From a paper:
FARP1 (FERM, RhoGEF and pleckstrin domain-containing protein 1) and its close homolog FARP2 were identified as guanine nucleotide exchange factors (GEFs) for RhoGTPases that play regulatory roles in neuronal development. FARP1 and FARP2 share a conserved domain architecture, containing a N-terminal 4.1, ezrin, radixin and moesin (FERM) domain, which is followed by a long linker (~200 residues) that connects to a Dbl-homology (DH) domain and two pleckstrin homology (PH) domains. We determined crystal structures of the FERM domains of zebrafish FARP1 (zfFARP1), mouse FARP2 (mFARP2) and zebrafish FARP2 (zfFARP2). As expected from their high degree of sequence identity (>60%), the structures of these FERM domains are very similar to one another, with root mean square deviations within 1.0 Å.
FARP2 also interacts with PlexinA family members, contributing to both Plexin-mediated repulsive axon guidance and dendritic development. In particular, the FERM domains of FARP1 and FARP2 contain a Lys-Arg-Lys-Arg (KRKR) motif in the loop connecting strands β5 to β6 in the F3 subdomain, which is highly conserved in FARP1/2 from different species. Overall, the surface of these FERM domains show highly polarized surface electrostatic potential, with one side positively charged while the opposite side negatively charged. Interestingly, both the FERM domains of mFARP2 and zfFARP2 form similar head-to-tail packing patterns in the crystal lattices, as a result of interactions between the positively charged and the negatively charged faces of the proteins. These packing patterns lead to a linear array of the FERM molecules, which may cause the oligomerization and precipitation of the proteins. The first arginine residue in the KRKR motif (Arg277) in the FERM domain of mFARP2 makes a salt bridge with Asp216 from the neighboring protomer in the linear array. The linear packing of the FERM domains of mFARP2 and zfFARP2 in our crystal structures suggest a potential mechanism for the oligomerization of these FERM domains. We speculate that the oligomerization, if occurs in the cell, could be a mechanism for regulating membrane targeting of FARP1 and FARP2.
Numbering used by the authors: 37 to 322
Write the structure that this text describes.
Amino acid sequence: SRMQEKHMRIRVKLLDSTVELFDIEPKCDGQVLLTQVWKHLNLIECDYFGLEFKNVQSYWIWLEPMKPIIRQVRKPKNAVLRLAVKFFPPDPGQLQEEYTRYLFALQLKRDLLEERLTCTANTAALLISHLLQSEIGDYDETLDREHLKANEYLPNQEKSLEKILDFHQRHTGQTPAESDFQVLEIARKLEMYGIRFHMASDREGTKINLAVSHMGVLVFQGTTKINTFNWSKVRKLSFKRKRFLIKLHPEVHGPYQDTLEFLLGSRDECKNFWKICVEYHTFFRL
């Protein structure tokens, strides 16, 4: 006999791609699972992190700490979630623990592989060369080529093999911590560092990509950044159905207007973007 409810088995894909299994009562709030994961990892700076899952609409959503797990994931038999950085600070090299910096380097590795973190060809190759130094150590042509055959860093990485090898040869003797630090140093200056797009349209019907960062709410047209609504200028964030509302400094040359509106693809996509913006503001401001 059991004095607890039957537990659900949840697979958690970690940042190194290993999978750990966690058994939890479906009615438990997300925090229960989050804390088991932080313990398994001995992750001190856990406030930067979350667990995410992919919905039927194929987009990633964050596990909420104060809602029952079963109501969020819905799959009693095989819930799968993955560890991810939620909050990207401007200077991750200044994170307090080597372990946290290690996890951030792994996150950036994933964002490069998944084509979220974009950059010039040489810069991508340089990033990968430091990732190689951290994982397999000093350059050797055979060791590098065999590793790159069995481990993916970028789609069509073979195009950049020569550049990757060339840069790796420069990193002789560098430790994994040094290598992670270099990954963070290179990545943090990239326009796409920590960026996840949420598709929307503006007042004129132009298709844009919304994002949020430690600096504020961001607007991209295609891949080009066209606005930064800095937190200091943001008075309120709201949403109604598919509409995302930013209350901001008013326009100078027009009848008084303090609010910009963007239309997302659905109520829930809108709500999810609103949520991450509010969370970013709380994390990085006051």
